[PDB]
Enzyme design. Structure first.
Site, PDB file in Angstrom:
ATOM      1  N   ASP A 250     -11.503   4.871  -6.422  1.00 56.23           N
ATOM      2  CA  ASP A 250     -11.098   3.543  -5.992  1.00 56.23           C
ATOM      3  C   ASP A 250     -11.838   3.159  -4.717  1.00 56.23           C
ATOM      4  O   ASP A 250     -11.920   3.948  -3.770  1.00 56.23           O
ATOM      5  CB  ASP A 250      -9.588   3.521  -5.761  1.00 56.23           C
ATOM      6  CG  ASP A 250      -9.060   2.131  -5.496  1.00 56.23           C
ATOM      7  OD1 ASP A 250      -8.996   1.737  -4.315  1.00 56.23           O
ATOM      8  OD2 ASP A 250      -8.715   1.429  -6.470  1.00 56.23           O
TER       9      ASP A 250
ATOM     10  N   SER B  98      -3.032  -3.089  -5.903  1.00 61.38           N
ATOM     11  CA  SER B  98      -3.395  -2.726  -4.523  1.00 61.38           C
ATOM     12  C   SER B  98      -2.108  -2.533  -3.723  1.00 61.38           C
ATOM     13  O   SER B  98      -1.260  -1.727  -4.139  1.00 61.38           O
ATOM     14  CB  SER B  98      -4.409  -3.711  -3.959  1.00 61.38           C
ATOM     15  OG  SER B  98      -5.576  -3.736  -4.759  1.00 61.38           O
TER      16      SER B  98
ATOM     17  N   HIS C  49     -12.060  -1.418  -8.186  1.00 57.14           N
ATOM     18  CA  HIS C  49     -10.849  -1.759  -7.442  1.00 57.14           C
ATOM     19  C   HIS C  49     -10.076  -2.804  -8.231  1.00 57.14           C
ATOM     20  O   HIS C  49     -10.615  -3.873  -8.533  1.00 57.14           O
ATOM     21  CB  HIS C  49     -11.219  -2.291  -6.060  1.00 57.14           C
ATOM     22  CG  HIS C  49     -10.041  -2.546  -5.175  1.00 57.14           C
ATOM     23  ND1 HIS C  49      -9.083  -1.591  -4.912  1.00 57.14           N
ATOM     24  CD2 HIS C  49      -9.665  -3.653  -4.493  1.00 57.14           C
ATOM     25  CE1 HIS C  49      -8.168  -2.099  -4.107  1.00 57.14           C
ATOM     26  NE2 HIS C  49      -8.498  -3.349  -3.837  1.00 57.14           N
TER      27      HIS C  49
END
Ligand SMILES: O=c1[nH]nc2ccc(Sc3ccccc3Cl)nn12
Ligand SMILES: *[C@@H]1O[C@H](CO)[C@@H](O)[C@H](O)[C@H]1NC(C)=O
Length: 344
Positions: A244, A146, A290
């Site tokens: 995503d 991330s 994710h």
């Protein structure tokens, strides 16, 4: 609880609130492989949203409440069943407590309520690890998920540059960017501007070649993988879900899909697939999800019959195409979960 906390000996390299940053370490004597993982967790870009983040996301802004240990999971696991790739490596988890996408170089001061030192935290962790065995490394893999994945892209060449200047030119620095490859695309209904404001608020720094291309006031471009990646010299493996969930969130997509949204989602995956066409080491499944690399079941997903731990192993071999051991794995099917191995 296999990784142990070490707060930085240089207590002037701090989290947002001035508390010392740190890292969690599990040594593997005899292994010359070092994995340094950058945690994610969004960011904050002004006093008011940083104050709110300090109320309810304080572990991402302070080390005061950090536990003494963490359990390594996924790519940070030391068990070969959970981590077929690097189970025997020296494991480092660097907590994200700078709220700056790992780009900042600004101390808390008379004029600054918060310190944004993400870029300096990485460099100080590296320097202090050199006295703990990193001086003997053959490969330093800087990984992250991330905001940490974007942090890999922003910092991998600086780590390589740091080690060269410190006199360790034999350590091979490489990057693994997971879920940090975003598009500055049009929203489905009405990030660049927040990154723009954030760099100014953080004193954020970007890689030098990328900075020189885009020049003053335009450094925000270097936070986007497809723009910064071509400027990098260190080998970087890119892991990115084609759909995503964080990309869809910033695009104001929230999931019976009608034509406009169907076309938007299909175009996003195509944009995706296009930006990775010239990325030789990549793993991009057609899933709505994710992150991957520190999930315990990260071994499950496959692209074209190849798992991510296998692809990373093939990438290691390629850095010594390979028969039956590929490194470029991008799905071509155009809709979330058309790959049957997507997470449930
Ligand atoms: O930590 C998480 N989870 N999901 C996300 C999404 C964006 C970000 S920062 C960022 C990085 C590159 C480009 C744009 C942005 Cl805005 N961080 N993040
Ligand atoms: C501590 O870190 C700061 C910021 O990187 C640096 O300026 C300072 O020289 C460091 N101190 C030591 C003793 O290395």
């Amino acid at each position: 609880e296999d990784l142990r906390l070490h707060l930085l000996l240089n207590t002037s390299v701090t989290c947002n609130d001035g508390s010392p940053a740190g890292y969690y370490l599990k040594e593997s004597r005899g292994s010359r492989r070092w994995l340094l993982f950058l945690e994610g967790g969004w960011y904050c870009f002004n006093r008011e949203n940083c104050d709110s983040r300090y109320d309810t996301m304080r572990r991402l802004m302070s080390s005061r409440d950090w536990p003494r240990t963490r359990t390594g999971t996924g790519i940070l696991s030391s068990q070969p069943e959970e981590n077929p790739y690097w189970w025997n490596a020296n494991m480092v988890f660097i907590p994200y407590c700078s709220s700056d996408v790992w780009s900042g170089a600004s101390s808390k001061s008379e004029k600054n309520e918060y310190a944004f030192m993400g870029a300096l935290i990485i460099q100080e962790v590296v320097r202090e690890l050199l006295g703990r065995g990193l001086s003997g490394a053959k490969v330093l893999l800087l990984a992250g998920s991330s905001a940490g994945g974007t942090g890999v892209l922003l910092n991998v060449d600086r780590v390589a540059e740091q080690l060269e200047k410190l006199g360790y030119p034999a350590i091979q620095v490489r990057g693994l960017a997971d879920s940090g490859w975003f598009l500055d695309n049009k929203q489905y209904r009405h990030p660049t501007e927040a990154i723009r404001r954030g760099i100014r608020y953080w004193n954020g720094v970007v890689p030098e070649r990328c900075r020189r291309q885009f020049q003053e006031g335009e450094e925000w471009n270097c936070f986007f993988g497809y723009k910064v990646y071509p400027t990098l010299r260190s080998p970087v493996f890119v892991v990115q879900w084609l759909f995503d969930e964080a990309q869809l969130t910033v695009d104001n997509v929230h999931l019976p899909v009608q034509e406009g949204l169907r076309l938007y989602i299909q175009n996003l995956g195509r944009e995706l697939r296009h930006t990775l066409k010239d990325v030789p080491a990549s793993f991009a499944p057609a899933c709505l999800s994710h992150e991957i690399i520190i999930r315990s079941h990260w071994t499950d997903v496959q692209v074209k019959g190849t798992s991510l731990p296998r692809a990373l192993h093939c990438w290691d071999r390629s850095l010594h195409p390979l028969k039956g051991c590929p490194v470029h794995l991008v799905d071509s099917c155009p809709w979330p979960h058309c790959n049957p191995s997507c997470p449930t």
